Amino acid sequence: LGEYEGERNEVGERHGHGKARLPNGDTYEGSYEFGKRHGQGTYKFKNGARYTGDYVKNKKHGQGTFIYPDGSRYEGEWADDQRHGQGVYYYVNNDTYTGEWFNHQRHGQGTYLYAETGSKYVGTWVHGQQEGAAELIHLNHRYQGKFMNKNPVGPGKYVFDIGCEQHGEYRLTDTERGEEEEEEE
Amino acid sequence: KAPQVIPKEESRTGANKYVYFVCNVPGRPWVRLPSVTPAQIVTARKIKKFF
Amino acid sequence: MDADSLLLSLELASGSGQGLSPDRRASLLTSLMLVKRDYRFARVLFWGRILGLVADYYIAQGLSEDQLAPRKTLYSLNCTEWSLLPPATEEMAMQISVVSGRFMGDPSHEYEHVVQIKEETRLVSIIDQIDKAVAIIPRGALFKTPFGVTHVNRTFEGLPLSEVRKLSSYFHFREADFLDSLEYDIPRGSWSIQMERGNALVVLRSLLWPGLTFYHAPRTKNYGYIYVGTGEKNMDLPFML
């Protein structure tokens, strides 16, 4: 229930560049193939969201820029209606993420910058969550250790810009034991 | 999306009741310590640094 | 701080502000003369006082003629009666790795490891750690003989004003130039060099074990050190540096 201003192939399927008005108020402006979106196109939502990027068979595949209704923004490579590959995500508090994606979640070597503090979180991600050996890069120091749930979990190390290290472990959820040694760098 | 900031106590009512002057060695002139914004200075007491 | 120059050393004027009462001062002159009498020491230095929680732990050390042996340190509560502490080793100092915090009052307080840990052994092993890590010696005060017996330099002048600010003109007072220099320090910058009263005083304030105070003037003959502090190691130091 809508309109489409473009060319149609022999049966009446949507092909090539065209502008279509979806029945709820969504608007797609881009290429079409066999009645499905395929190519660089600008998909607009009525709520405020907007996707400008490539399509393969009515699904986001390849590099695509997504505008989210809360204020978030993602440009990265897509695969089958999901973020999959090298992608850059920005959040509502201007925090940016730069890393790998598997299925709509952070998975692999990802870099998270906390823009309220300027500190960095360079390390591995499991299921969109801080898990694995990583590097919590602050201004003058950095934490090389293990993360399990938004927090250091086990043994680790604190590398400083003054030319020293601080060995230690996390015996609790939020408590770090500073024992025993401090090394040279 | 914007966090709120607790404004300064510009009068002498709260933590700015006493004005503070700092000199390094006696004989040197005193340096006036500035007034304190709460949410930027006292909430950041999780830092712990040498002077 | 030497026992013969306790009043001749600027303790409260050193800038740390953790000194003694006249009661504690007169008690140290009389009692350190007593432990120079009954314990045959070549010279006795007042090591310092640990503040504690319910009582103060006054610590003094005595030395033989060999000048590089482990110190026969002494402790007191009311700063008048002093008795010897047991000698320390690495396995006994390992035992307090599961406990932390200040220590209070009488040596008979048992700490939970359950192996009961005495206050006295924790005190003397902590004294050994503060002796090993910090409380430096000045340059030129300890000269070397061909034999293993080291004598204190009677001709010690021994630090020019150009070498006051340097890290390399201070060695660790520990058997190991003669000794390990202060540039072999972790972290880099764990000592606060500070200029009081112009060139007439310098303080090497330790930050790994505060509030340790090293006591100059140059052109002297003091050549002293004093630790008054909370007693535990500053593991927080590379964060604040």
Coordinates of C-alpha atoms in Angstrom, one line a residue:
Chain A
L1 CA 0.0 0.0 0.0
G2 CA 2.2 2.8 -1.3
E3 CA 3.9 4.4 -4.3
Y4 CA 7.2 3.8 -6.2
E5 CA 8.6 6.3 -8.7
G6 CA 11.0 4.3 -10.8
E7 CA 11.4 1.7 -13.5
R8 CA 10.0 -1.9 -13.1
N9 CA 11.2 -5.0 -15.0
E10 CA 9.1 -7.3 -17.1
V11 CA 6.8 -8.8 -14.4
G12 CA 6.5 -5.7 -12.2
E13 CA 9.3 -6.3 -9.8
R14 CA 11.3 -3.3 -8.5
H15 CA 14.6 -2.9 -10.3
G16 CA 17.3 -0.2 -10.5
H17 CA 17.3 3.2 -8.8
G18 CA 14.0 4.3 -7.4
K19 CA 12.1 6.0 -4.5
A20 CA 9.5 3.9 -2.7
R21 CA 7.1 4.9 0.0
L22 CA 6.5 2.1 2.5
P23 CA 3.0 1.9 4.0
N24 CA 3.9 3.1 7.6
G25 CA 5.8 6.1 6.4
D26 CA 9.3 4.6 5.7
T27 CA 11.1 5.8 2.6
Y28 CA 13.8 4.0 0.6
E29 CA 15.8 5.9 -2.0
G30 CA 18.3 3.6 -3.8
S31 CA 18.9 0.7 -6.1
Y32 CA 16.5 -2.3 -6.4
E33 CA 17.0 -5.8 -7.8
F34 CA 14.1 -8.3 -8.4
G35 CA 11.7 -6.5 -6.0
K36 CA 14.3 -6.4 -3.2
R37 CA 16.8 -3.8 -2.0
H38 CA 20.3 -4.5 -3.6
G39 CA 22.9 -1.7 -3.8
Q40 CA 23.7 1.6 -2.2
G41 CA 20.5 3.0 -0.9
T42 CA 19.1 5.5 1.7
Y43 CA 16.5 3.8 3.9
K44 CA 14.7 6.3 6.1
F45 CA 12.4 5.5 9.1
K46 CA 9.5 7.6 10.2
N47 CA 10.7 7.7 13.9
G48 CA 14.0 9.4 13.0
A49 CA 16.3 6.5 12.1
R50 CA 18.1 6.4 8.8
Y51 CA 20.2 3.7 7.1
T52 CA 22.5 4.8 4.2
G53 CA 24.4 1.9 2.9
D54 CA 24.6 -1.2 0.7
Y55 CA 22.0 -4.0 0.5
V56 CA 22.1 -7.6 -0.6
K57 CA 18.6 -9.2 -1.0
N58 CA 16.5 -7.1 1.4
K59 CA 19.3 -7.3 4.0
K60 CA 22.1 -5.0 5.1
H61 CA 25.4 -6.4 3.7
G62 CA 28.6 -4.5 3.2
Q63 CA 29.5 -1.0 4.4
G64 CA 26.5 0.9 5.8
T65 CA 25.8 4.0 7.9
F66 CA 23.0 3.6 10.4
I67 CA 21.4 6.4 12.4
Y68 CA 19.7 5.2 15.5
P69 CA 16.6 6.8 17.1
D70 CA 18.2 7.3 20.6
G71 CA 21.1 9.3 19.1
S72 CA 23.5 6.4 18.4
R73 CA 25.3 6.0 15.1
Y74 CA 27.1 3.1 13.4
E75 CA 29.1 2.9 10.2
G76 CA 30.7 -0.4 9.5
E77 CA 30.5 -3.6 7.3
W78 CA 27.2 -5.4 7.7
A79 CA 26.2 -9.0 6.9
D80 CA 22.6 -10.4 6.9
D81 CA 20.7 -7.7 8.9
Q82 CA 23.5 -7.7 11.6
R83 CA 26.7 -6.0 12.4
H84 CA 29.5 -8.3 11.3
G85 CA 33.1 -7.1 10.6
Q86 CA 35.0 -3.9 11.2
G87 CA 32.6 -1.4 12.5
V88 CA 32.6 1.9 14.4
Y89 CA 29.8 2.6 16.9
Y90 CA 29.0 5.9 18.6
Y91 CA 26.7 6.1 21.6
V92 CA 24.6 8.8 23.3
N93 CA 27.3 10.1 25.6
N94 CA 29.7 10.5 22.6
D95 CA 31.5 7.3 23.5
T96 CA 33.0 5.6 20.5
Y97 CA 33.8 1.9 19.8
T98 CA 36.2 0.7 17.1
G99 CA 36.4 -3.1 16.7
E100 CA 35.1 -6.3 15.3
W101 CA 31.5 -7.6 15.3
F102 CA 30.2 -11.1 14.8
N103 CA 26.4 -11.0 15.2
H104 CA 24.9 -7.7 16.4
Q105 CA 27.4 -7.6 19.3
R106 CA 31.1 -6.8 20.0
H107 CA 33.2 -9.8 19.3
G108 CA 37.0 -9.7 18.9
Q109 CA 39.6 -7.1 19.2
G110 CA 37.7 -3.9 20.0
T111 CA 38.7 -0.4 21.2
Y112 CA 36.3 1.4 23.4
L113 CA 37.0 5.1 24.3
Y114 CA 35.2 6.5 27.3
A115 CA 34.6 10.1 26.1
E116 CA 33.5 11.3 29.6
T117 CA 37.1 10.4 30.8
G118 CA 39.2 10.0 27.6
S119 CA 40.4 6.6 28.8
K120 CA 40.6 3.7 26.4
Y121 CA 39.6 0.0 26.5
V122 CA 41.6 -2.0 23.9
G123 CA 41.0 -5.7 24.1
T124 CA 38.9 -8.7 23.4
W125 CA 35.1 -8.8 23.5
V126 CA 32.8 -11.8 24.0
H127 CA 29.0 -11.4 23.2
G128 CA 29.2 -7.6 23.4
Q129 CA 30.8 -7.6 26.8
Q130 CA 34.2 -7.0 28.4
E131 CA 35.8 -10.4 28.5
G132 CA 39.4 -11.6 28.0
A133 CA 42.9 -10.2 28.3
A134 CA 42.8 -6.6 27.5
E135 CA 44.4 -3.1 28.0
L136 CA 42.5 -0.5 30.0
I137 CA 44.5 2.5 28.7
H138 CA 44.1 5.5 31.0
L139 CA 46.0 8.8 30.7
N140 CA 49.2 8.0 32.7
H141 CA 48.7 4.3 33.3
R142 CA 47.2 1.2 31.8
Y143 CA 45.8 -2.1 33.1
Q144 CA 46.9 -5.3 31.3
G145 CA 44.8 -8.0 32.8
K146 CA 41.8 -10.3 32.6
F147 CA 38.2 -9.0 32.5
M148 CA 35.0 -11.1 33.0
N149 CA 32.0 -8.9 33.7
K150 CA 32.7 -5.1 33.2
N151 CA 35.5 -5.4 35.8
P152 CA 38.9 -7.0 36.3
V153 CA 38.6 -10.6 37.5
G154 CA 42.0 -12.2 38.1
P155 CA 45.7 -11.5 37.9
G156 CA 46.9 -8.5 36.1
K157 CA 49.5 -5.7 35.8
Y158 CA 49.5 -1.9 35.9
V159 CA 52.0 -0.3 33.4
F160 CA 52.9 3.3 34.2
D161 CA 54.4 6.1 32.2
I162 CA 56.9 6.8 35.0
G163 CA 58.9 3.7 34.0
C164 CA 57.6 1.0 36.4
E165 CA 55.0 -1.7 36.7
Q166 CA 52.7 -2.9 39.5
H167 CA 52.0 -6.6 39.6
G168 CA 48.8 -7.7 41.3
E169 CA 45.6 -9.7 41.3
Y170 CA 41.9 -9.1 41.9
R171 CA 40.8 -11.3 44.8
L172 CA 37.3 -9.8 44.8
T173 CA 34.9 -8.3 42.3
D174 CA 36.1 -4.7 42.8
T175 CA 39.2 -5.1 45.1
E176 CA 42.8 -5.4 43.8
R177 CA 45.6 -7.0 45.8
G178 CA 48.8 -5.1 45.1
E179 CA 51.1 -7.9 46.3
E180 CA 54.0 -8.5 45.7
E181 CA 56.5 -7.3 43.1
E182 CA 57.0 -4.1 41.1
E183 CA 59.2 -4.3 38.0
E184 CA 61.2 -2.1 35.7
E185 CA 60.5 -0.9 32.2
Chain B
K1 CA 22.1 13.3 26.7
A2 CA 24.0 15.6 29.1
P3 CA 25.1 15.0 32.7
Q4 CA 24.1 17.5 35.3
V5 CA 26.7 19.5 37.3
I6 CA 26.2 20.6 40.9
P7 CA 27.0 24.4 40.9
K8 CA 29.5 26.2 43.1
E9 CA 28.8 27.5 46.6
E10 CA 29.8 31.0 45.7
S11 CA 29.0 32.3 49.2
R12 CA 30.7 31.4 52.5
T13 CA 27.8 29.0 53.5
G14 CA 29.1 25.4 52.8
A15 CA 32.6 24.1 52.1
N16 CA 33.8 27.6 51.1
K17 CA 33.2 29.0 54.6
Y18 CA 36.9 29.6 55.1
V19 CA 39.2 31.2 52.5
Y20 CA 42.5 29.4 52.0
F21 CA 45.9 30.9 51.3
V22 CA 49.0 28.8 50.5
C23 CA 52.7 29.8 50.6
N24 CA 55.5 27.4 49.9
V25 CA 58.3 28.7 52.1
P26 CA 57.6 31.5 54.7
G27 CA 58.8 34.9 53.4
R28 CA 57.4 34.1 50.0
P29 CA 54.1 35.7 49.3
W30 CA 50.9 33.8 49.8
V31 CA 48.9 32.4 46.9
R32 CA 45.1 32.4 47.1
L33 CA 43.4 29.0 46.7
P34 CA 40.4 29.2 44.4
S35 CA 36.8 28.3 45.3
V36 CA 35.6 24.7 44.9
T37 CA 33.0 23.4 42.5
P38 CA 31.5 20.3 44.2
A39 CA 30.8 17.9 41.4
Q40 CA 34.1 18.4 39.6
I41 CA 36.5 18.6 42.5
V42 CA 35.1 16.8 45.5
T43 CA 33.3 14.0 43.6
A44 CA 36.7 13.3 41.9
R45 CA 38.2 12.2 45.3
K46 CA 38.6 8.7 43.9
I47 CA 41.9 10.0 42.5
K48 CA 44.8 9.9 45.0
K49 CA 47.9 11.8 43.9
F50 CA 51.1 13.3 45.4
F51 CA 51.6 17.0 45.7
Chain C
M1 CA 69.6 9.8 64.7
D2 CA 72.6 9.2 67.0
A3 CA 72.2 8.9 70.7
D4 CA 74.9 11.4 71.5
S5 CA 73.3 14.0 69.2
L6 CA 69.5 13.6 69.7
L7 CA 69.1 17.2 71.0
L8 CA 71.7 18.2 68.4
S9 CA 69.5 17.0 65.5
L10 CA 66.7 19.1 64.1
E11 CA 63.9 16.5 64.5
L12 CA 60.7 18.7 64.6
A13 CA 62.4 21.2 62.3
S14 CA 63.1 18.6 59.6
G15 CA 59.7 19.3 58.0
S16 CA 58.0 15.9 58.6
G17 CA 56.5 17.2 61.9
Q18 CA 56.6 13.8 63.6
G19 CA 59.1 14.2 66.4
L20 CA 59.1 13.7 70.2
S21 CA 57.9 15.2 73.4
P22 CA 60.4 16.4 76.0
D23 CA 59.3 13.3 78.0
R24 CA 60.2 11.0 75.1
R25 CA 63.4 12.9 74.4
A26 CA 64.8 12.7 78.0
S27 CA 63.6 9.1 78.1
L28 CA 65.7 8.4 74.9
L29 CA 68.9 10.0 76.2
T30 CA 68.7 8.1 79.5
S31 CA 67.4 4.8 78.0
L32 CA 69.8 4.8 75.0
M33 CA 72.7 5.5 77.4
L34 CA 71.3 2.4 79.3
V35 CA 71.2 0.2 76.2
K36 CA 74.7 1.5 75.3
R37 CA 75.8 0.3 78.8
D38 CA 74.3 -3.2 79.1
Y39 CA 74.3 -4.1 75.4
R40 CA 77.9 -3.8 74.2
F41 CA 77.3 -1.6 71.1
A42 CA 79.8 0.5 69.3
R43 CA 77.2 3.2 68.7
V44 CA 73.4 3.3 69.1
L45 CA 71.1 5.2 66.7
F46 CA 67.5 6.0 67.5
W47 CA 65.7 4.4 64.6
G48 CA 62.3 6.0 65.0
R49 CA 58.8 5.5 66.4
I50 CA 55.9 3.6 64.9
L51 CA 52.7 5.4 65.7
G52 CA 50.5 2.3 66.1
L53 CA 46.8 2.3 67.0
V54 CA 46.6 2.2 70.8
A55 CA 50.2 2.7 71.7
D56 CA 53.5 4.0 70.2
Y57 CA 56.3 1.6 69.2
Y58 CA 59.6 3.3 69.8
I59 CA 62.4 1.5 67.9
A60 CA 66.1 1.9 68.4
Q61 CA 69.0 0.0 66.8
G62 CA 72.5 -0.8 68.0
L63 CA 75.6 -1.7 66.0
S64 CA 78.9 -3.5 66.6
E65 CA 82.3 -2.6 65.2
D66 CA 81.7 -4.5 62.0
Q67 CA 79.2 -1.8 60.9
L68 CA 77.5 -4.0 58.2
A69 CA 76.0 -6.8 60.3
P70 CA 72.2 -7.1 60.8
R71 CA 71.2 -4.7 63.6
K72 CA 70.3 -5.9 67.1
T73 CA 67.2 -3.6 67.2
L74 CA 65.3 -2.8 70.4
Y75 CA 61.7 -1.8 71.1
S76 CA 59.8 0.0 73.9
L77 CA 56.3 0.9 74.8
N78 CA 56.7 3.6 77.6
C79 CA 60.0 4.6 76.0
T80 CA 61.9 3.8 79.1
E81 CA 62.5 0.0 79.3
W82 CA 64.1 -1.6 76.2
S83 CA 64.5 -5.3 75.4
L84 CA 66.1 -7.1 72.5
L85 CA 64.0 -8.3 69.5
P86 CA 64.6 -11.7 67.9
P87 CA 66.6 -11.8 64.6
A88 CA 64.7 -11.8 61.4
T89 CA 64.7 -14.1 58.4
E90 CA 62.9 -14.3 55.0
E91 CA 60.6 -17.3 56.0
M92 CA 59.4 -15.5 59.1
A93 CA 58.8 -12.3 57.2
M94 CA 56.8 -14.2 54.6
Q95 CA 54.2 -15.1 57.3
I96 CA 52.4 -11.8 57.3
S97 CA 51.6 -11.8 53.6
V98 CA 47.9 -12.6 54.4
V99 CA 47.4 -9.7 56.8
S100 CA 47.6 -5.9 56.5
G101 CA 47.0 -2.7 58.4
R102 CA 48.3 -1.0 61.5
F103 CA 49.5 -2.9 64.6
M104 CA 48.6 -1.8 68.1
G105 CA 50.2 -1.8 71.6
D106 CA 51.3 -5.0 73.4
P107 CA 53.4 -7.6 71.5
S108 CA 51.1 -10.4 72.7
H109 CA 48.3 -9.5 70.2
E110 CA 47.5 -12.6 68.1
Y111 CA 46.7 -12.1 64.4
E112 CA 44.7 -14.4 62.2
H113 CA 46.5 -16.0 59.3
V114 CA 44.3 -20.5 61.7
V115 CA 47.9 -19.8 62.7
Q116 CA 48.1 -17.2 65.4
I117 CA 50.6 -14.5 64.3
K118 CA 52.3 -12.5 67.1
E119 CA 52.6 -8.8 67.1
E120 CA 56.3 -8.9 68.0
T121 CA 57.4 -10.9 65.0
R122 CA 55.4 -8.7 62.6
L123 CA 57.0 -5.7 64.2
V124 CA 60.6 -6.9 63.9
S125 CA 60.1 -8.2 60.4
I126 CA 58.6 -4.9 59.3
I127 CA 61.6 -3.2 60.9
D128 CA 63.8 -5.4 58.7
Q129 CA 61.8 -4.4 55.6
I130 CA 62.1 -0.7 56.3
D131 CA 65.8 -1.2 57.0
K132 CA 66.3 -3.1 53.7
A133 CA 64.3 -1.0 51.3
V134 CA 64.8 2.6 52.7
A135 CA 66.8 4.6 55.3
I136 CA 69.7 5.3 53.0
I137 CA 73.3 6.0 54.0
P138 CA 75.1 9.2 52.7
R139 CA 78.1 9.1 50.4
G140 CA 81.5 9.0 52.0
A141 CA 80.4 8.0 55.4
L142 CA 81.2 4.3 54.8
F143 CA 84.7 3.7 53.4
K144 CA 86.0 0.3 52.4
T145 CA 88.8 -1.8 54.0
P146 CA 90.5 -4.7 52.2
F147 CA 89.0 -7.0 54.9
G148 CA 85.3 -7.4 55.7
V149 CA 85.3 -5.1 58.6
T150 CA 83.9 -1.6 57.7
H151 CA 84.7 1.4 59.8
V152 CA 82.6 4.6 60.0
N153 CA 84.5 7.5 58.3
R154 CA 85.9 9.8 60.9
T155 CA 87.1 12.1 58.1
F156 CA 83.6 12.2 56.5
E157 CA 82.8 15.7 55.2
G158 CA 81.4 14.3 52.6
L159 CA 78.7 15.8 50.3
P160 CA 79.3 18.9 48.2
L161 CA 76.3 21.2 47.4
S162 CA 76.4 20.2 43.7
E163 CA 75.9 16.6 44.7
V164 CA 73.1 17.2 47.2
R165 CA 70.3 17.1 44.7
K166 CA 71.6 14.0 42.9
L167 CA 70.1 10.5 43.4
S168 CA 73.5 8.8 42.9
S169 CA 75.1 10.5 46.0
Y170 CA 73.1 8.3 48.3
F171 CA 73.5 4.5 48.9
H172 CA 71.2 2.0 50.7
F173 CA 72.3 1.2 54.2
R174 CA 72.3 -2.5 53.5
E175 CA 75.0 -5.2 53.0
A176 CA 75.1 -6.3 49.4
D177 CA 81.3 1.8 44.9
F178 CA 80.4 0.2 48.2
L179 CA 76.6 -0.3 48.2
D180 CA 73.6 -0.1 45.9
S181 CA 72.9 3.5 44.7
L182 CA 69.6 5.2 44.9
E183 CA 69.2 5.2 41.1
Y184 CA 68.5 1.5 41.4
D185 CA 65.1 2.4 42.7
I186 CA 61.6 1.1 41.7
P187 CA 59.6 3.2 40.9
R188 CA 61.7 6.0 39.4
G189 CA 61.2 9.0 41.7
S190 CA 60.3 7.3 45.0
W191 CA 62.3 9.9 47.1
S192 CA 61.3 13.5 47.8
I193 CA 64.4 15.8 47.8
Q194 CA 63.4 19.0 49.5
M195 CA 65.3 22.2 50.4
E196 CA 64.6 23.6 53.9
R197 CA 66.3 26.7 55.3
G198 CA 68.3 27.1 52.1
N199 CA 71.5 25.0 51.9
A200 CA 71.5 24.4 55.6
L201 CA 69.2 21.3 55.4
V202 CA 68.1 18.7 52.9
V203 CA 65.5 16.0 53.4
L204 CA 65.3 12.7 51.5
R205 CA 61.7 11.8 52.3
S206 CA 60.9 8.2 51.4
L207 CA 57.6 7.7 49.6
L208 CA 57.7 3.9 49.5
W209 CA 57.8 4.0 53.3
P210 CA 56.4 7.3 54.6
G211 CA 57.2 9.2 56.8
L212 CA 60.9 8.3 56.7
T213 CA 63.1 11.4 57.0
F214 CA 66.7 11.5 56.1
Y215 CA 68.7 14.1 58.1
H216 CA 71.4 16.3 56.7
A217 CA 73.0 19.5 56.9
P218 CA 76.0 19.5 54.6
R219 CA 79.4 20.4 56.1
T220 CA 78.4 17.9 58.8
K221 CA 78.5 15.2 61.0
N222 CA 74.8 14.5 60.9
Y223 CA 74.4 12.0 58.9
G224 CA 71.2 10.7 60.5
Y225 CA 67.8 9.2 59.6
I226 CA 64.4 8.7 61.3
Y227 CA 61.2 6.8 60.4
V228 CA 58.0 7.9 62.0
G229 CA 55.0 6.7 60.1
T230 CA 51.9 4.4 59.9
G231 CA 54.1 1.3 59.5
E232 CA 52.9 -0.5 56.4
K233 CA 54.3 -0.3 52.9
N234 CA 53.0 2.3 50.4
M235 CA 51.9 0.0 47.6
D236 CA 49.8 3.0 46.3
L237 CA 53.0 4.8 45.3
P238 CA 53.1 4.4 41.4
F239 CA 49.5 5.7 41.2
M240 CA 50.3 8.9 43.0
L241 CA 53.7 9.3 41.3

